[PDB]
Amino acid sequence: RVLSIQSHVVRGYVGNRAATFPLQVLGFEVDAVNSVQFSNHTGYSHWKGQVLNSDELQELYDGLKLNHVNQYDYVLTGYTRDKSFLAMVVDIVQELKQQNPRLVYVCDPVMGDQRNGEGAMYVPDDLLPVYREKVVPVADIITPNQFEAELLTGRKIHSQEEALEVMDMLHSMGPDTVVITSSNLLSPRGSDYLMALGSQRTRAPDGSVVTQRIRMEMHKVDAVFVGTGDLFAAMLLAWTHKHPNNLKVACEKTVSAMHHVLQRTIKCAKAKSGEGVKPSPAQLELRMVQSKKDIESPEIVVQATVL
Ligand SMILES: CC[C@H](CO)Nc1nc(OCc2ccccc2)c2ncn(C(C)C)c2n1
Known part of the structure; x- marks a missing residue:
């Protein structure tokens, strides 16, 4: 089905690690070519790896x-x-x-x-x-x-x-x-x-x-996330699939899932960080697995307007 050319990280979710679970849990036969294999994204203090x-x-x-x-x-x-x-x-x-x-x-x-x-x-x-x-x-x-x-x-x-x-x-x-x-x-x-x-x-x-043309508006979140956009394009592929000509219908569910994934991330993230310190890049890593259900079955908790 899909030929995804992106990056891979041992830990966390960025690139292919952010686009394969979804596309898969949706039921897409994903073929992955890892552009790089790093130990984690370059937002952590240290990092090592190779590039293709x-x-x-x-x-x-x-x-x-x-x-x-x-x-x-x-x-x-x-x-x-x-x-x-x-x-x-x-x-x-x-x-x-x-x-x-x-x-x-x-x-x-x-x-x-x-x-x-x-x-x-x-x-x-x-x-x-x-x-x-x-x-x-x-x-x-x-x-x-x-x-x-x-x-x-x-x-x-x-x-x-x-x-x-x-x-x-x-x-x-x-x-x-x-x-x-x-x-x-x-x-x-x-x-x-x-x-x-x-x-x-x-x-x-x-x-x-x-x-x-439409315009969605997601409830901004008080945090710095790495990968949100890879997760975005992935699902956009999923959904715009079932609804080719419904630019509206897609984003609607696509954006939907992200609020879920993100707040569970943020929630958990905090849960880990005491209440007077910013969660580190480590704890901010998308609770991808746990949104096992959200990703597949969205609560269309967002809506837009044509034009
Ligand atoms: C560049 C900005 C962020 C640092 O916060 N780092 C980072 N680091 C990554 O790690 C892989 C990489 C490392 C070095 C050179 C090229 C890709 C990323 N893979 C996808 N993405 C985003 C576009 C979502 C990656 N982002």
Whole structure:
């Protein structure tokens, strides 16, 4: 079903460790290529491990070709630091497109994050061109930051309408689906929340247009989590699966599950930390296992609005 090219960590949930349980517990046949194998994410004090290069990635895809098992339903990628690695990935995703007409490519274009004023990049700046020029033109679903969206389109978002028009710039780039997973925009409910935007432009009979758009708002949480976005794109794959043309119906359940997972995480997290000290990166690790049930059967405790 899915060819997930992401990272692996012995401990915690980031990358492939954040996307495989779900996609699996949902019932997707997940094939995983670990871009790196680190002992834990780089937010802990120390960390060690190895990274995979372009040839090594090449090697594994090769293996899959020779056994004629290189046929995929979906392809999911995320955080990378090697421009070459990212490049190599585009080639692969192409061919895989020739075997199965359209195995949707779900791409989380991880580049950095925003705080009210501007942003802080995670990756070196040279990756920017590749995502903009080579990557995005082939992705079929993308889940960027506001920062990330701004970096791709080159346009800075100051309001909601400005936002919808930057998504369009994205659509015409290729992705018939765009979902700004978070933003600095205040929302119709106070800074007590987080706003995310969603828009899919479904070609159709011969009017040649249709474009849907909604706006979910999740109850912000008082903590710093690593991996939330990998968990996001994973489930978005699950759900937008059952409801191809229902950009609304998906996020709705996708976002739903995260509030669950997160608060149980936060809850537990605290439970562990005394009541006058910040939980460490260690205790903040997504209680993935324990959301065994939530992830599969969501309480649609969120709702949005078309436009
Ligand atoms: C870069 C920002 C965070 C530090 O808080 N570290 C981190 N660390 C990771 O560990 C894997 C890695 C380590 C070194 C180079 C490339 C990937 C991550 N894998 C996925 N992700 C996110 C995009 C969710 C990873 N994030």
